[PDB]
């Protein structure tokens, strides 16, 4: 005879990080809409992070991003076509540069979503990080209109908060879009509007930067007669509201008591 209620061999049981879970859900939501996920580098060139996105130097708009500037010789930053890119190095302040890289390397129409680690020089508190994640979206092609951007986010909301969810758009500014907009989604349970992210129609100067860099690389122009929309949303804020995580600082804390709590979560 054997006691069957006796503990068995202590085989280890793994788990996924909250951010990996939230990012996966977001990526799934958009895959169902035809978006494909691709990634960019965490260490970027000012050209891709700012200049190519219509964000000058000593431009008031630069202030919307507190940047970590890097230094050191011997580092090789490869451009979209594997080339050796140059320019002052920094930690990307957002995933947006990736939409420039992708466009020089591909041709419309397409739908991409690019999750990624981003960095801002900031003070770490209960709802603020210097190291966090964003999910960028970019859909370009003949006839793409703001009505489609709104449709996308409407689908994001429904997919995230159920049939009783709603979306709200208000004009807001971004050097890389025009019209520009901020969007919030209605969260029926918490009974409140959540400011989710920014978006808009890709700015004319962005398409121009893309086709200039293409020509400078021998590629033919590809974004002359197309339009598109782009959006960007913070992951931690969403992960927090979705898992009831009180301190944004727990994500990079590494505390098992914390991480372990998400083994169930799919």
């Amino acid at each position: 005879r054997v006691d069957v209620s006796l503990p068995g061999a202590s085989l280890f049981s793994g788990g996924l990080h909250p951010i990996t879970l939230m990012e996966r859900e977001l990526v799934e939501i958009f895959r169902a809409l035809g978006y494909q996920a691709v990634e960019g580098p965490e260490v970027e060139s000012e050209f891709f992070n700012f200049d190519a996105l219509n964000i000058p130097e000593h431009h008031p708009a630069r202030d919307m991003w507190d940047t970590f500037w890097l230094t050191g010789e011997g580092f090789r930053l490869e451009g979209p076509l594997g080339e050796e890119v140059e320019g002052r190095l920094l930690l990307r302040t957002h995933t947006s540069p990736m939409q420039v890289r992708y466009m020089v390397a591909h041709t419309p129409p397409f739908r991409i979503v690019v999750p990624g680690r981003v960095f801002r020089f900031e003070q770490t508190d209960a709802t603020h990080e210097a190291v966090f994640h964003q999910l960028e979206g970019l859909v370009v092609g003949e006839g793409i209109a703001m009505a489609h951007l709104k449709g996308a986010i409407y689908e994001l909301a429904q997919a995230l908060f159920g049939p009783d969810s709603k979306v709200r758009f208000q004009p807001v500014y971004f050097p890389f879009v025009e019209p520009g907009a901020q969007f919030a989604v209605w969260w029926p349970e918490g009974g409140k509007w959540l400011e989710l992210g920014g978006a808009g129609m890709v700015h004319p100067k962005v398409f121009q930067a893309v086709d200039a860099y293409r020509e400078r690389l021998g590629l033919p122009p590809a974004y002359r007669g197309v339009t598109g929309f782009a959006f960007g949303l913070g992951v931690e804020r969403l992960a927090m509201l979705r898992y009831g995580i009180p301190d944004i600082r727990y994500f990079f804390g590494g505390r098992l008591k914390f991480l372990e709590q998400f083994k169930g979560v799919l």
Binding site: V2, V4, A9, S13, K257, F258
Partner: protein, 785 residues
Amino acid sequence: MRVPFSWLKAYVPELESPEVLEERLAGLGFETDRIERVFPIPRGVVFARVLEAHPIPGTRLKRLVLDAGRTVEVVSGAENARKGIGVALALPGTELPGLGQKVGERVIQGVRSFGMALSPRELGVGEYGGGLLEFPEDALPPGTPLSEAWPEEVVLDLEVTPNRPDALGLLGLARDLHALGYALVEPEAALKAEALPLPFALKVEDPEGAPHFTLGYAFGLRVAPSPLWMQRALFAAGMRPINNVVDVTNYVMLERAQPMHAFDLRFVGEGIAVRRAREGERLKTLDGVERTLHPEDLVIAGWRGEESFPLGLAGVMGGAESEVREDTEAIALEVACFDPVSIRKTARRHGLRTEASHRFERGVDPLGQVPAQRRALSLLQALAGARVAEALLEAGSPKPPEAIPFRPEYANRLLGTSYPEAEQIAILKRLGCRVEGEGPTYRVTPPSHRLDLRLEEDLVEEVARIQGYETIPLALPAFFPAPDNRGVEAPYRKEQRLREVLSGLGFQEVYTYSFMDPEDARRFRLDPPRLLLLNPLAPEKAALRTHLFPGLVRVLKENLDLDRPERALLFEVGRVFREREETHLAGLLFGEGVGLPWAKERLSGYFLLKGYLEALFARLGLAFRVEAQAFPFLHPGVSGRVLVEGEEVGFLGALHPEIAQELELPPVHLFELRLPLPDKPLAFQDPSRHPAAFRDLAVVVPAPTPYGEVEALVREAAGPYLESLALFDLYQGPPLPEGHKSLAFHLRFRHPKRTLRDEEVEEAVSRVAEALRARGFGLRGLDTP
């Protein structure tokens, strides 16, 4: 269906070639399984006339005297060899398909056979080898190479779907090609009939089974072999020519999907009676098979005075007795439309599948009989020199087809095309439809031969296929899905994750047939299967599985006989049947276990499985407990039920020893659960910053008491500040009261807001010693460091 290129070409003269024809039929909805060239005939084979047949005394052989340009002699043993017919003479030196042994001049029973007369099989035109090919005695000038009147043919093996029974006729196919733009040549049935009474009557006693039935009358017949072009045509189509009349009926059947049969009037008596067969009633069908009819069999019978007798199994096969032969002079021609279901049952009932039944089962043009009668009687007049009566005997009056409303705009809207209205109307017209009105919604009434045209949608497929499916553009739909369609995929996704985690944890997925051997309900000690198969693949697969583990155990065995796996951790997810269809998850453990390959110590058996399972649920974030419980198929000492999140969802244990033995198997461990697994929502618990109080203590318990009950008690009373509680050591023996055991528990306490006072911890352990003893359990250790 065999489609002889040159035959089809007689209706569609402009056909480019068999390859292009194959292409054209594909776009029309007919796939060709294969193309074949079929009648290679060497120059050595010439047409010959049998001037005389002389039996060789003492043998069953005959000496044929043939006019083949010059008179030659040949020896034959064929029963049909006789004077007055034409034959295929293979002159000495000829290379024949069938034989591979160069034909030569040789001596047989005293005579020099200068080559030999051929059968369909020897010439290579048909499988029949029991007699000589019979040609009209004047088919060709004696001695001319047969090739010159029998060119090779290319035959397409065409698939004809159930919706296109009109395509079971070469002319039906011709019309489809016509709609594509090809010119159509319909055979004109030139008849020179005479007005006079038919020497027989028609009495349709069962109009249900014979909704439309006609009888033609042809007399003064001169039965003989069919022209070469017809034998060539029939052979290419897979049929064997017999004679004038018989061939004509087969030819027309193949031309316009209309089975027909010529009855020799000698046996008809006063008239034909389409009636049900009386039980017992016998019938020797055409295949020479003596049969016994069933009261549900539609029969074509005759009557003489006060007697009724069967003549043929209606719409399936004619009787052997009234078959038209050389001495026949007059016939009653049967051209009808029979009830498809009746023909279906009769056909099965007698194990018959004929060119006729097949067509009647799929359906026949309800108003094609009369036109078919003219085609046939016309051909009989031309090939059997038949005199034909002007009138027919007809019973039944089918109604023409009704108008179908058609909207060019809808056709284009349903297809996503933009075909100009005029093109659409024209096409429907080429297919023989009548179109009335001027839009936007027309009255389209189809031809009686198209049983598949009843709805507007049917008409839009006509436009699409004639225009060509490749003309339909490619597009992708855009729409916000209706609300009740959200998250509809959660269930499927849930199970998929489960499988993936299992495969990642270390389990190997396996697929097993849903079938079960009824006898295993016995072998594996399981309640009998609720669902059984009326038409099993074998008695071993006569039931529907009720459990997943039996199959897993059997694959373990088969894997041990083919290859010799040392271990095996398996899993399978599948549908089970008992009371209701449900989804189960089963796993199997077997082998030495886990440890160092070179070393010897190992982890295995029950606790290895319970180990992997604890991980699974830890991974899934669900409570997993295993209480003791008996299961017929499990070892009584190694058996327990599974409790995920508090509810019983399956079992876990070692395969019963007796079972194992009857299967010649080493100890096997396994489990089986019911899906979907309980779902536990997240309830994030902010972790306390302050330190946690560590305290140990052992529990004195009798060997019988199960671990769970203790652990449940220790925890239950350990208080609301208990963090952990783990069994780090089981011990039973001296100095403990034998039959007793101690449970070393690693306890840990903690408080979210602040640190814990030693007063609270002491109390905690105390509240435990309390009930710990109230249950009859000791405390080998207390307040242990």
